[PDB]
Structure 1
């Protein structure tokens, strides 16, 4: 007997402002490219350099884009420097200083005639976003009622995709995507941060962290009673007491220790492979090629098809949210991997028959949109919250620094190496991705145990049994 209280929904929603931040900053950079390149040309040339070549502009732009990922790699790997020392909620209150700072660098670089400020600002917003992708699932995972852990955990990915969609809408030239307003398109990131710092004082630190890491039992119990809307919180205080007992019997874990301890090695392998199943799914290739295929299919301003694909992107994230607690994690993730595997084959075949049987441009659009649906059914939301469920309280931060960093790093290497691969492979690049997908589908079938509705204590014991 536990309803969902307005206070619990408020807490998790405010935390997922971090997710919206990650989505917005990831997706905001593409639309203003040419406006910002003219800005770079004007800035240099007014400081007395010769006008930059295309080569130089491509170079400086590419650095603006990419230095975000470098920040995200670092930020996410450092989550373990914050969450135990400051607590989960307080950590969020602290790193908003980074968000406001990076948003100011980006938002002010034009009136300050500074290309360096734009780049610096993209790195600092990257550090911020990396810390977010680790803080938000840890908080959500630790305060959620056990039967709603994955559902609430899906709001993370929903926050991300909505952030992306809003970044693209704002980037329209009649909104903020203009030569006069692109600083506000970029600086916009400080408003959600300002909004989250105002609201975070009304969000409790999770009763789990309070009881387990700070041994504050009777104050954890009072938080719990309000979040749940009931006063019988008995089963659940002690399960937390069981985790507290468990944690005081364990040496807690460094990143290196995850890999030497045997009880951890397969949870951490599941954790990382699931991140690769997300970033090597082919989803990147689909967005890359997407704008090109649209223009080719008679859509003379293809940003609206990109926005339309974001709408689809959002729809099927909610679909997953409603399915994840009944269907399970295994089922939703493998449905995704196989559904994608089918679509990337149809893309290779479409593109190869394209200007010989001419209708194929629409076929390839159908495949792209069906791909996005299958991505959000499982491989999108699940890798972001599952790591929190595979570990007990003590190892969780280090585990989520590793899993989070491997998500950003694989994303970075993919964005780096794919243009070459596509150049030599052409349309056959969707066939290597079909090959990854089948392999990940195999991996999930044999290696990933079901975690839906199970306590941390019963998930951990099963991993310990197997290691025995």
Structure 2
């Protein structure tokens, strides 16, 4: 606890990327009908026959999904940037992609080009994939050890705030209209121009400068400013230790992450935690929501979702104030457990949907409580924890692997779930309850507490476990 404006500024400017990721994730839902009308008109205006609903659904599905494909590629490409350019400059450099993607999506209507929309979603996907790796890596290396998890939770906060804002902007009376939806999608350009202006005044990680570039006194002076104290000897020395370790060790690529015994457990934890986020059922809960919301008298679908967005935000903040006290294990487990209870309730309330006339209110309650438990742990923790499971040398390759598995599992779930729901119906949530319980067991037996521990302490403990 040594928090000056500089540290806040640096972390806040970095979480613009988190906001960007959240915004582009949530922005696409509301304007579906409007964009399909655009796609139809683009073909009709040629004088051609109007497209079938099958073709529209097809093009629309590609628009949505190609974003994930971009993210898979970008998140796995994180390793190409962070050691070569640094952590701060990597973020500055890739804003080219955010500007590019936003231009395509923003100009696709006036250019009357469905192809530009699809292309824009791919490029903004690439950008967001790089962000999901760059931001926690930067925050992790620049935060005081006692606040590493708290600050790391600001990544997820930026993401959920980004989602909320995109949804609100998606309202018909704001930017969600026939004449304003290019502005809706094009909006992502503005935070990029703001971030690029602000970033050069954010310092590079002192850890990176000292450990990777051997610039000790440069790191110290920066460390003194960020933590607002002249005595930073304990931290500077701990960085010297990590630096000595890295120059005595072979620097790991992706493939060797899996050949080294002392890396196997950390990397397996990292991947599994990414899965515990995307296979939680969090992507199934809303698939049903939009239709459950009608039955309960909402008759206002985006409004039902925005409300969930507020709950989404509140419990991310709750997680922020808990993660340094309760620890990562406890918050992850509690969240997994509460989601297990809610998904089970979802199955029951849906199975009794029309034998009893109150069940739609029950399902909504289950959905909101589900969202709350998701953000307690499984939402924010898996993003910043892999940065904690590794020291300086293998972190970049580890975050490329972890991040990719997160984006990939998200993509596969979205591909496979509609089928599963079609064959299992209400029982599909029981499958997630099984996943959630299994993940809960994994965390309880296999995931060490990382709260307040130095990277060196954590790594040595993994080395000790590997020696027997």
- TM-score surpassing 0.5? yes
2:392 aligned counterpart, secondary structure: coil
1:232 aligned counterpart, secondary structure: coil
TM-score using structure 2 length: 0.99
CA distance in 2, matches of 1:450, 1:40: 51
2:424 aligned counterpart, secondary structure: helix
Deviations 1:229-279 (A, max 9, x none): 000010000100001101001101111000010000000000000000000
Q: How far has the Cα of 1:358 moved from its partner?
A: 1.0
1:325 aligned counterpart, secondary structure: coil
Deviations 1:381-440 (A, max 9, x none): 000000000001000000000000000000000011101100110000010000001100
CA distance in 1, matches of 2:413, 2:457: 36
Deviations 1:179-231 (A, max 9, x none): 00000000000000001001001100010000000001111110000001000
CA distance in 2, matches of 1:296, 1:254: 52
Tell me what 1:300 maps to: 299
CA distance in 2, matches of 1:42, 1:359: 42
CA distance in 2, matches of 1:133, 1:48: 43
CA distance in 2, matches of 1:49, 1:11: 53
Q: How far has the Cα of 1:297 moved from its partner?
A: 1.2
CA distance in 2, matches of 1:386, 1:184: 35
CA distance in 2, matches of 1:374, 1:218: 44
Q: How far has the Cα of 1:365 moved from its partner?
A: 1.0
Q: How far has the Cα of 1:49 moved from its partner?
A: 3.1
Deviations 1:132-153 (A, max 9, x none): 0000000000000000000000
Q: How far has the Cα of 1:355 moved from its partner?
A: 1.2
Could you list the structure 1 runs, at least 4 aligned residues long, displaced by more than 4 angstroms after superposition.
none
Q: How far has the Cα of 1:48 moved from its partner?
A: 4.0
Tell me what 1:331 maps to: 330
1:393 aligned counterpart, secondary structure: coil
RMSD of aligned residue pairs (Cα, Å):
0.7
1:323 aligned counterpart, secondary structure: coil
CA distance in 2, matches of 1:457, 1:407: 26
CA distance in 2, matches of 1:408, 1:3: 35
Bigger mean CA deviation after superposition, 394-403 or 47-56: 47-56
Q: How far has the Cα of 1:375 moved from its partner?
A: 0.4
1:85 aligned counterpart, secondary structure: helix
CA distance in 2, matches of 1:46, 1:294: 36
Deviations 1:339-398 (A, max 9, x none): 100111111111111211111111111111110000000000000000000001000000
Bigger mean CA deviation after superposition, 50-59 or 327-336: 50-59
Tell me what 2:141 maps to: 142
1:156 aligned counterpart, secondary structure: helix
CA distance in 1, matches of 2:48, 2:130: 38
> How many residue pairs are counted as aligned between the two chains?
467
CA distance in 2, matches of 1:361, 1:45: 40
Q: How far has the Cα of 1:47 moved from its partner?
A: 2.7
Q: How far has the Cα of 1:45 moved from its partner?
A: 2.1
CA distance in 2, matches of 1:421, 1:292: 18
Deviations 1:55-102 (A, max 9, x none): 111111111111000000000000000000000000011000110010
1:284 aligned counterpart, secondary structure: coil
1:42 aligned counterpart, secondary structure: helix
Deviations 1:301-331 (A, max 9, x none): 1211110000000000000000000000000
CA distance in 2, matches of 1:40, 1:443: 46
Bigger mean CA deviation after superposition, 31-40 or 454-463: 31-40
Bigger mean CA deviation after superposition, 14-23 or 348-357: 348-357
Q: How far has the Cα of 1:176 moved from its partner?
A: 0.2
Tell me what 1:165 maps to: 164
CA distance in 2, matches of 1:375, 1:40: 36
Where structure 1 has 5 or more consecutive residues not aligned to the other structure, the ranges are none
2:12 aligned counterpart, secondary structure: helix
2:83 aligned counterpart, secondary structure: coil
1:84 aligned counterpart, secondary structure: helix
The answer to whether the aligner puts 1:320 opposite 2:303 as a matched pair is no
Deviations 1:13-52 (A, max 9, x none): 1000000000000000010011111111111222343221
Bigger mean CA deviation after superposition, 293-302 or 198-207: 293-302
CA distance in 2, matches of 1:441, 1:287: 22
CA distance in 1, matches of 2:442, 2:410: 20
CA distance in 2, matches of 1:177, 1:359: 32
CA distance in 1, matches of 2:294, 2:307: 14
CA distance in 2, matches of 1:113, 1:350: 45
Bigger mean CA deviation after superposition, 350-359 or 333-342: 350-359
TM-score using structure 1 length: 0.99
CA distance in 2, matches of 1:295, 1:358: 13
